[PDB]
Design a protein around this ligand. Structure first.
Ligand code: ATP
Ligand code: MG
Length: 258
């Protein structure tokens, strides 16, 4: 498992532009994508990250993967990362080879396809998981294949960027319980999600809004620290993940800080 820490992190996607402008002539001010971000999770813990559209959630994951350097603060992490990107993707080849890396573990594979609900899908194909991607998959199928790929990989830190985005409420719930909570029980993970139930199960919660930490702490803390926000969303969780994003974004603007 990895430990993960951000201490006072501020970052600007535009920083490079400023550096080139100064180079051509021989710290940047602007709109930070992330501002004064703090969190720590221990080995094996889950951090749920939520927030409004454009808040920096994906950008936060990108900093952990070394794609964006902090202009201020420190990030500490080590080890192997598995990343489930916000848009799904599929490489030419079988369903099974979309899921598995260099090595194959029969049992691990079966338990991944089971927890991501891919069994019923696969059983409707003449060639099962050996069907070649010819035929095209739904957005829901693709996203579940992409999550199985990320979770199958043996890693130290799993970064799951809205993997329930295109799923219904029921499928989202079973997969969250079987995969994220059971199958990955002992793994360090960061899940971008809009479900209040998910934040209730997390070890830590980070809510972002306009780049800033709207909230960091536990679920109990959230209910008292942001009591009107909490009250308005706690029936939000019966809406689709797709739909909960617009509502959550409205709700953060509604109870935005000072
Ligand atoms: N990989 C990237 N490289 C550079 N800029 C990025 C990258 N990903 C997102 N951005 C930009 O960073 C800013 C913050 O948005 P980001 O995508 O981090 O928000 P988000 O909270 O993930 O939103 P959504 O909820 O809409 O997925 C946006 O202007 C976006 O265009
Ligand atoms: Mg999102």
């Amino acid at each position: 498992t990895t430990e993960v820490v951000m201490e006072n992190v501020t970052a600007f996607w535009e920083e490079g532009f400023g550096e080139l402008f100064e180079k051509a002539k021989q710290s940047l001010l602007g709109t930070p994508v992330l501002k004064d971000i703090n969190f720590k999770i221990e080995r094996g813990q889950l951090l749920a990250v939520a927030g409004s559209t454009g808040a920096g959630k994906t950008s936060l994951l990108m900093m952990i993967m070394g794609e964006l350097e902090p202009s201020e603060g420190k990030i500490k992490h080590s080890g192997r990362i598995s990343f489930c990107s916000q848009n799904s993707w599929i490489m030419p080849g079988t369903i099974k080879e979309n899921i598995i890396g260099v090595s194959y573990d029969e049992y691990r594979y079966r338990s991944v396809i089971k927890a991501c609900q891919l069994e019923e899908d696969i059983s409707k194909f003449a060639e099962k998981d050996n069907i070649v991607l010819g035929i095209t998959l739904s957005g829901g199928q693709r996203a579940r294949i992409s999550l199985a790929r990320a979770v199958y990989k043996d890693a130290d830190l799993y970064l799951l960027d809205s993997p329930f985005g295109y799923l219904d409420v029921l499928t989202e719930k079973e997969i969250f319980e079987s995969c994220v909570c059971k199958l990955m029980a002992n793994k360090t993970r960061i899940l971008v999600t809009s479900k209040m139930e998910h934040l209730k199960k997390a070890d830590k919660i980070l809510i972002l809004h306009e780049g800033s930490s709207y909230f960091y702490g536990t679920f109990s803390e959230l209910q008292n620290l942001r009591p009107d926000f909490s009250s308005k969303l706690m029936s939000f969780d019966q809406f689709s993940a797709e739909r909960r994003n617009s509502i959550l974004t409205e709700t953060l603007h509604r109870f935005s800080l000072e």
